[PDB]
Amino acid sequence: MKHSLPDLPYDYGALEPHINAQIMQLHHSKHHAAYVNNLNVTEEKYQEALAKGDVTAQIALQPALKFNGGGHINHSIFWTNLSPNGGGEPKGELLEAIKRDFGSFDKFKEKLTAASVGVQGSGWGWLGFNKERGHLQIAACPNQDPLQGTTGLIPLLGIDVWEHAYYLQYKNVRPDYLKAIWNVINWENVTERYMACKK
Amino acid sequence: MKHSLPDLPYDYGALEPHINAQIMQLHHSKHHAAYVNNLNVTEEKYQEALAKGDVTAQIALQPALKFNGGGHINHSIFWTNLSPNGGGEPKGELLEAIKRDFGSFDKFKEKLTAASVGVQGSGWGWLGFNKERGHLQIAACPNQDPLQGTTGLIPLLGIDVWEHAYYLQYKNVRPDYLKAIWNVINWENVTERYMACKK
Amino acid sequence: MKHSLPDLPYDYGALEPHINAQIMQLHHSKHHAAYVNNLNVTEEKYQEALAKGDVTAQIALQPALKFNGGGHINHSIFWTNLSPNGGGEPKGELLEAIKRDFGSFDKFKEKLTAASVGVQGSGWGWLGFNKERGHLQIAACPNQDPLQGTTGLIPLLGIDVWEHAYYLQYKNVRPDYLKAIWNVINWENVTERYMACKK
Amino acid sequence: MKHSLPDLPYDYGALEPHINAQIMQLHHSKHHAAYVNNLNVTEEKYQEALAKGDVTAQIALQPALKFNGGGHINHSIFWTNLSPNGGGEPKGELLEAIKRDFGSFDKFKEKLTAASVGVQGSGWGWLGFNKERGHLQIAACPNQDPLQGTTGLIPLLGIDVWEHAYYLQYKNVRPDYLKAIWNVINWENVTERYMACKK
Ligand SMILES: [Mn+3]
Ligand SMILES: [Mn+3]
Ligand SMILES: [Mn+3]
Ligand SMILES: [Mn+3]
């Protein structure tokens, strides 16, 4: 099927000083590229195993498929969630949905930050949409487990809290990284994902 | 491209009184049949997701593939591991490998029984072969997770400790079920699986 | 400092024909009794490890504590969730909360049944209360993992889908067990647990 | 009981150029210190919960206890596994045990490197001793899960492959970090741990 490393919609240094250029260059051109390359290799092996009816080979390939496939999914959403145009607060029905489900935008900020900072090891903090219940929901995913594939929630905004996402600039202080990322959140993209959920 | 429910190599009541006919009939004609049918349904869904490059659908289908695919793998080995002619002790290279790696046949029995009984919830106890290290190994698998697909060990002898495998006859006393199953272990089949590792 | 096996609030045969007396007698007098006894044994071992500062022993004891501690918690709620007088529909604020969060009582029944039946292996289906969001929530727990300890939800109604809870009467047909248990649900007790959240 | 951050047996820059001083200072004075502080807080909460017979609170505290307790255990072993005196090959019975169980020292190096590099997300690569089987064994542990508490193996040599252990110096190239760490392995300490296993 071939999965490809998507181009960035902005310069590597466009998010400075909140996220420096060296992190962006390494995160995109090294980490994400590795996920896409290993995903294509894994998908080809699974097609061969599925054709043979080799159930053992299919099951043995599941960790690599979820890890590299999730890494591709999560990082491709992550780039669209950020923008040099970003920051501030959302508007329209997204802001009102945040008000109804979390109380206020400031309360939503506190809960997503707490879930992000609270991740033990590598993982992701997500703002998702619960199509069954019809409200917003915050969830944390370990390693590269993708939100929709594992929980059914529709991903709206993701925060990478892998150490490679901040350590070069913020060292061990994960909260400092979380506080700075709010300044480059592309709320236009987050609203477009939310409206796609709505009828 | 079908996986099929294998026929039993013996009558449903051939293992009495150690395992009664109603358990054997239900385990084969109901439980195993459900695993194979759901495995075929799941495999077709995965082929559609794989053809479209839908990574989210591939990851969402992994629990059903592992559960039903493992259930088919585990139970098809299980039927060949039993025989009305079985019981006693193995001979040839199998017995010497057991003594070399476990000390004695009786201690091997105790170690596999302890791992079986120790399963919290549903699972399987396995005697496996480590091709890398070239010795025997005992492992426990949760639910329907298959041995080779999840651990790399080659399955030689498996003990189903799902409650459906003994509850109708032995109720909550799992050790009573474990003591009786040694009387119908098909050491001929276990020897052939062990020799398949050797070359 | 003992945890004790609670007495049943009804006769072992009081739930017939929906759940027969032999299942109730075995589930309470054998399964639950084993959980409480092993919980007390495990709690004493942890006190010794905790007093010595043995972190390795504390971590090694975690599976036994969660399994037997959860087994005690889950089953003691389970007995109070059932009654020979039960069945029908709840009234008061409970019914309005169910309609508000699920649409209707019948759809809530379908959603809890689907989560129950969908458990791969041993586990529990739960109706819980999310104190943070202030609405009802359905969750599934594996093995004996308790609802509040692992998810933070307050347990209101639990459905045991371990095979020992139905196999003697309904064999492999889990949906048949689910359909009959609605006839003895103690909505009075579920209402009291729900009101305990309210204040 | 109080757990304390152990002093380093060497200068922060004593492992240069293989591991630079800034990584060592951050790894010890920030990461490990956080594990010890959170472990003491968690241990105090568990003592209160155990005294009350609060099983739910005990189970809710298990992730924090394993994560911070394991972080303390793993890092306290890690510092003793490294030395400016280190590098080269082991001698005596340790080297012969490596020869018998892995074929050669070079083959052991390849297998431990592969397990380290193969960790998906945060984790550890371990050389352990299997007291039951009486041979050496390589295992990988996720996040801060300690070796002995989770697997029963006695830890001899540990390799931290959390991104905070190498990213400042080696960026995304985990193999470059693994190749350099062999030059500072304290084989004297590893042999002392191995002989403590022997009668
Ligand atoms: Mn990343
Ligand atoms: Mn079975
Ligand atoms: Mn039960
Ligand atoms: Mn570390």
Author numbering:
A (entry chain B), B (entry chain A), C (entry chain A), D (entry chain B): 0 to 198
Authors' description from the paper:
To visualize the effect of the electronic state of the metal on the active site protons, all-atom, D-labeled neutron structures were obtained for Mn3+SOD and Mn2+SOD to resolutions of 2.20 and 2.30 Å, respectively. The two data sets collected were from the same crystal treated with appropriate oxidizing and reducing chemicals and the redox conditions were maintained during each data collection. An SSHB is seen between WAT2 and an ionized Tyr34 while Gln143 is in the canonical amide form hydrogen bonding to WAT1 as a –OH molecule. An ionized tyrosine residue at physiological pH is unusual though is potentially explained by polarization from the pronounced positive charge of the metal. The rates indicate an important role for His30 k1 that may correspond with our observations of its changes in protonation in Mn3+SOD. Starting from the five-coordinate Mn3+ resting state, Mn3+ acquires an electron (in reality from the substrate superoxide) that coincides with Nδ1(His30) acquiring a proton from the nearest solvent molecule (the crystallographic position of WAT2) and Tyr166 gaining partial covalent character from the proton of Nε2(His30) to form a LBHB.
Human manganese superoxide dismutase (MnSOD) is a CPET-based oxidoreductase found in the mitochondrial matrix that reduces ROS levels by eliminating O2•− with the unpaired electrons of the active site metal. Trivalent Mn oxidizes O2•− to O2 (k1 = 1.5 nM−1 s−1)8 and the resulting divalent Mn reduces another O2•− molecule to H2O2 (k2 = 1.1 nM−1 s−1).
